[PDB]
Nucleic acid binder design. Structure first.
Ligand SMILES: [Mg+2]
Ligand SMILES: [Mg+2]
Ligand SMILES: [Mg+2]
Ligand SMILES: [Zn+2]
Lengths: 44, 337, 176, 159, 138, 132
RNA sequence: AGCUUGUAGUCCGUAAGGGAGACAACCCAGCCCGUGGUUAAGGUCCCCAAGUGUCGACUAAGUGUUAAUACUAAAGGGCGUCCCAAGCCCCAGACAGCUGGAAGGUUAAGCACUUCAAAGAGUGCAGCUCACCAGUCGAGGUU
RNA sequence: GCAGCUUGCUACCUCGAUGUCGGUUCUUUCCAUCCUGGCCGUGCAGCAGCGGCCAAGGGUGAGGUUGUUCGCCUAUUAAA
RNA sequence: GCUCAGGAAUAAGAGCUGAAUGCAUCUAAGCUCGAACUCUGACCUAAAAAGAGACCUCUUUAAGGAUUCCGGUAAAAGACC
């Protein structure tokens, strides 16, 4: 199964394009590497 | 170069491999107490080796229950006299001896080691150490013990070996009061170690003289055509071009053996009181026969026969209570056949 | 218009706060909290049910520090006045976890069939109640309650599987 | 052969091609892109270089290709006019043994550009200014020099 | 007798080195583990762990671990200790962790300019913490 | 694999030719390598009793010959010791032809076989008649 | 290329003393002997004589604490931080948060309008969501 | 751009000699990590991969040809 | 024959609190975890540690050490027991 809060705390984040680091869903810049382009974490 | 990799020859964990500075092994650390007061150490003399046929009791072993033949090592362990009670003051620099009190009554044979302390400050030294423990300067209390090898016929010596054995208790007042109880008395090895419990055996190992690198570090003999070109038991190279010096980690000749070594988890298998229970026909080879009370330790122990062996309860014992063993046969047939 | 870098915290009634040395303590009905808040050039003053934090210089580090200190002070007064309650959910796929509190650490039994239970610490004077399917956390310190919830959620982190298929664990549904 | 080899300007201009032999011509195809007729572009920007560098013809062609593709995909095919001002006139020769008779053969051309000399001039409408500026930014990434954009026309038209 | 609580390591070391090179006084530096070292904690620990594990075992710098011996080493650096002046200066310097028993009730003087509150940041670690993270017992 | 109850020296090493004593048709098999044995530098791969080995058939039928098979050594002249203290030895070495998991290719094994391999590979124990 | 081959000046070669950590030719300096004084280069927290010197800022990285140089890493990027200038919205109430709506439409199978301040041939995991007008703390926001 | 671990370029040192390849023996070092340890992403269901980050404590073997380095081939192996 | 860990601080990383930027944010301060690495813990050596140590005992023409002598648990000579 898939749960609401589980996907909120697991699959509801963005990922840096370069370093693949987890960043917040509202953040437009990676905290680790400073890259400008982030993608949502894949869930399919 | 396509490097072929080999582990380093020998261990650098035991360097500099020099002659140990005493015939008595010394304990650098002691285990923390987990129960009632008792001496954490005993000293015996290694007689020799035999084997027992004991029913296996080790839990989860493949051969549990069935008969096995375990090489044991009989150790001649007479009573010891707790000579002195010594307290230590702890600070930033380290532990320092703050005071001692020697027993009033002591064996006459002790003069061969140290001059006999007089029966003087016995009550007053004890009250001084009590005041020091009360105010807070004292941190730990240790007992001084010596062997009494005058009884043993297999060991040629009659002078005692003096050593420190920490007391195992919870409160420093409790340690002090137990040390007051046992000060100046003879405490047998049954009052320290129980039958079936692990211990740590330390003793100066067998001296092998100035041995070569092939025997000292187990380096490789020269092979093939190089076996008969002039260097057979010599290390191939002592270093590179740079750095322009021989490292301390190169195998080389030197003093092999007669080092202090500590063996962990040496089980106790028997607590005997008559030497005819284990002494074989013709006695032991180059020792004689057992005449005091002994303990049978499973497996080997560092040092040759007659060497002093220091026994302490284990410092890294993985396993739980092991129970009493069930010896079916102590092999007292001749060691000379 | 004209900026005011200084910030003011009104101390609510029933809560007495002081600034003895560089440590800030708030005492109230819900409990009492002591904290250390010292930054160079940031002066904190308590007076008459109201605390003001102000910086001598107006550079961006001073503005960030005065904002952070003001937020910490208001969190301290809210914890010592009303406290914080956090919510988490206990959801599993196939193996029902046994969740219990046996001291200052939580117990997570049979997490994905594991025979060794996971242990999650409890920070501060924090009350954790595992009320069936969800966990409730309460405390006078917002950092302590947040870190207790974080410890409970972090020790349930599956460490090799796809999170799009394996989703067991304990998850926050409401922060401090 | 990286552009760092034939980059620094420490030699005189080797351009008189009647006293040399067999120059391989530049790969640069065009020098005008977009609307080559509408002179009524209000906002005009230029990419200028701020060092003394020799740009190879392959570097110029790559910069022109990226800038022209970005401008065609941003402002349409006829919504811009982009001009590569500089022709590669210098002939670049490599010593293709050892250092005996070291005067090498011609292995390509290049353009020697001075500091603040405009490379690309782009004329665009008001709304397509940002896309043209960003495409010119992508053009200077393929050049061997630090490049900064400067606005020619309609400085007030933008801000 | 210098109380090194809340003092910069280098500034205290330079002051004590110049005082000992004046050449008359035996200087005791109590509370050596409470001396301050500016900079971030990560950089300080990185430099001190690099300097700790540097030398060879037969030759190399046996850099100390105790805080008092580290402070003694730092004052040793700012002296001509290979000379007779430096040797006399290092013999006339004693550094202790905490207060030894013979310095209880004695009078202390602390350097004004070597104070740690003259610094304007929170980026510091004490010398005691650096010694402790180097594996020392004190 | 599963630990036996007796210590077994690794007598045979790589290159040894051992009389294969099953009815697989292979008569003499040379030990190429040993499963579950990472070596050290210069050390030949050694195989004592109960070890699975990679062997190449040296003598045997035309179809078994030159193949690379899996074999289990069941006898060895190098004496090993039982847990009760007694040392056990055999008149000659011998290996049987098996699979990866331990199942022999043959159906009867001539001669004795050590009881350790019977307790480790029970099919090797059942297939062989006399066990020592 | 501390490569090779020229040209102008000055050096080492044949050049001390003082200073750059050491430095053939880098700076002061061209130098008979002794004494006194003051300066050159460069330095003044200690090693080391003289500044824990003054004023105004910057740096948080032990970056740096390296005039020249054979002894010193670039392109690219930074809502790291400190400044200057100019557009745009802005106490006739913006920016970022908190409340009612995205209602007429269209299924041109949205994700291969007469006219209302407030509703598209549409931003999102058919209800579930933004752009957008109303209110709100009440002052700077963005390029 | 870095490295200086391949071949070049050069001719600064050594021609009153710095014993010149490969192997073997033994010790050490770097990380740009093959395995072992910790993570992140996936077009990650699991198993098993793929790519990246941290990490130099340990391991990195036995053989056939060839003088070889390199490279091929064999069967093991956590990896060789 | 024996040959374990445990604990602390950490790297990449994962979070909590939290502003700059009223919200949000793992970071700008602060805090919690996080590796075969580091440290402690074990083990060997270690008063020639120039801050060259602590304590107790014995006794000042002694205490005690070495040699001669019989040896071996040690040993290349010395040393050691
Ligand atoms: Mg000149
Ligand atoms: Mg001249
Ligand atoms: Mg000069
Ligand atoms: Zn990133």
């Amino acid at each position: 199964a898939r749960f609401p809060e589980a996907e909120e705390r697991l699959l509801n984040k963005k990922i840096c394009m370069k370093c693949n680091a987890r960043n917040a869903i509202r953040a437009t810049r990676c905290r680790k590497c400073g890259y400008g382009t982030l993608r949502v974490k894949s869930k399919e | 170069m396509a490097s072929i990799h080999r582990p380093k020859r020998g261990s650098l964990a035991f360097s500099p491999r020099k002659r140990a500075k005493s015939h008595i092994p010394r304990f650098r650390a002691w285990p923390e107490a987990t129960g009632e007061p008792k001496l954490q150490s005993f000293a015996g003399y290694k007689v020799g080796m035999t084997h027992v046929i004991m029913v296996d009791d080790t839990k989860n072993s493949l051969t549990q229950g069935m008969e096995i033949s375990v090489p044991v090592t009989v150790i001649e362990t007479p009573a010891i006299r707790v000579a002195a009670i010594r307290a230590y003051a702890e600070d930033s620099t380290g532990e320092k001896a703050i005071a001692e009190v020697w027993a009033a009554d002591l064996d006459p044979e002790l003069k061969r080691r140290i001059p006999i302390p007089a029966a003087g400050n016995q009550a007053e030294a004890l009250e001084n150490i009590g005041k020091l423990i009360e105010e807070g300067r004292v941190s730990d209390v240790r007992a001084v013990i010596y062997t009494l090898p005058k009884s043993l016929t297999g060991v040629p010596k009659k002078v005692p070996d003096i050593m420190e054995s920490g007391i195992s208790a919870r409160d420093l007042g409790t340690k002090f009061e137990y040390s007051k109880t046992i000060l100046g008395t003879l405490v047998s090895v049954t009052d320290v170690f129980k039958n079936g419990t692990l211990v740590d055996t330390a003793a100066i190992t067998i001296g092998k003289g100035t041995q070569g690198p092939v025997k000292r570090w187990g380096i490789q003999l020269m092979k093939g055509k190089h076996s008969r070109q002039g260097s057979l038991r010599q290390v191939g190279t002592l270093g590179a071009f740079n750095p322009s010096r021989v490292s301390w980690r190169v195998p080389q000749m030197g003093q092999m053996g007669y080092h202090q070594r500590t063996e962990f988890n040496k089980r106790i298998l028997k607590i005997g009181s008559d030497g005819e229970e284990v002494t074989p026909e013709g006695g032991f080879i180059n020792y004689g026969l057992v005449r005091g009370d002994y303990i049978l330790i499973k497996g080997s122990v560092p040092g040759p026969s007659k060497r002093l062996i220091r026994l302490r309860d284990p410092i890294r014992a993985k396993k739980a209570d092991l129970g009493e063993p069930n010896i079916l046969y102590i092999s007292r047939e001749s060691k000379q056949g | 218009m004209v900026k005011e870098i200084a910030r003011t915290i009104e101390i609510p009634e029933g809560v007495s706060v002081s600034l003895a040395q560089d440590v800030f303590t708030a005492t109230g009905p819900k409990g009492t909290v002591e904290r250390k808040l010292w930054y160079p050039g940031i002066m904190i003053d308590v007076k008459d049910g109201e605390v003001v934090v102000d910086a001598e210089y107006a550079r961006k580090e001073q503005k960030a520090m005065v904002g952070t200190f003001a937020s910490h002070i208001r969190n301290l007064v809210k914890g010592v006045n009303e406290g914080f309650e956090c919510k988490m959910s206990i959801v599993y796929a196939h193996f029902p976890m046994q969740v219990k509190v046996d001291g200052k650490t939580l117990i997570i039994g049979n997490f994905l069939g594991e025979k060794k239970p996971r242990f999650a610490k409890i920070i501060g004077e924090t009350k954790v109640k595992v009320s069936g399917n969800d966990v409730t956390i309460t405390g006078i310190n917002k950092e302590d309650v947040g870190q207790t919830a974080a410890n409970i959620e972090q020790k349930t982190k599956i460490k090799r599987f796809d999170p799009r298929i394996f989703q067991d664990g304990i998850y926050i549904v409401q922060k401090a | 052969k990286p552009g760092s080899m034939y980059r620094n300007v420490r030699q005189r201009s080797f351009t008189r091609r009647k006293y040399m032999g067999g120059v391989p011509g530049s790969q640069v195809i065009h020098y005008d892109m977009g609307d080559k007729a509408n002179t009524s572009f209000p906002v005009k920007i230029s990419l200028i270089v701020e060092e003394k560098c020799q740009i190879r013809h392959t570097a110029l062609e790559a910069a022109r290709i990226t800038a022209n593709r970005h401008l065609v995909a941003d402002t349409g095919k006829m919504g811009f006019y982009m001009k590569l001002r500089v022709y590669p006139h210098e002939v670049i020769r490599e010593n293709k043994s050892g250092m005996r008779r070291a005067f090498g053969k011609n292995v390509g051309t290049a353009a020697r550009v001075k500091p603040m000399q405009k490379i690309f001039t782009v004329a665009v409408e008001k709304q397509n200014f940002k896309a043209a500026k960003e495409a010119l930014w992508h053009a200077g990434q393929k050049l061997p020099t630090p490049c900064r954009i400067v606005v020619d026309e309609g400085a007030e038209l933008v801000q | 007798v210098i109380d090194a609580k809340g003092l910069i390591l280098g500034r205290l070391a330079s002051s004590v080195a110049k005082q000992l090179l004046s050449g008359d006084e035996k200087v005791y530096i109590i509370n050596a583990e409470q001396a301050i070292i500016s900079g971030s904690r990560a950089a300080t620990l990185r430099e001190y762990r690099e300097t700790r594990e540097r030398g060879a075992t037969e030759f190399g710098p046996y850099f100390p671990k105790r805080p008092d011996r580290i402070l003694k080493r730092t004052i040793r650096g700012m002296l001509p200790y290979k000379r007779a002046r430096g040797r006399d200066a290092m013999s006339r310097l004693k550094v202790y962790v905490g207060v030894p028993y013979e310095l209880k009730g004695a009078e202390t003087v602390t350097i004004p300019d070597a104070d740690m509150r003259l610094l304007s940041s929170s980026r510091y670690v004490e010398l005691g913490e650096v010694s402790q993270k180097m594996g020392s017992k004190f | 694999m599963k630990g036996m109850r007796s210590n077994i020296p690794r007598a045979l090493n790589a290159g040894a030719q051992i009389a294969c004593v099953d009815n697989t048709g292979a008569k003499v098999v040379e030990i190429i390598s040993v499963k579950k044995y990472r070596g050290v530098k210069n050390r030949m791969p050694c195989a004592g009793i109960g070890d699975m080995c990679v062997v190449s058939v040296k003598k045997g039928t035309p179809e078994m010959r030159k193949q690379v098979l899996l074999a289990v050594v069941v006898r060895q002249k190098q004496e090993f010791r039982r847990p009760d203290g007694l040392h056990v030895s055999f008149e000659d070495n011998a290996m049987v032809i098996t699979d990866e998991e331990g199942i022999p290719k043959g159906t009867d094994i001539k001669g004795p076989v050590a009881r350790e391999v019977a307790e480790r590979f029970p099919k090797i124990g059942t297939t062989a008649s006399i066990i020592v």
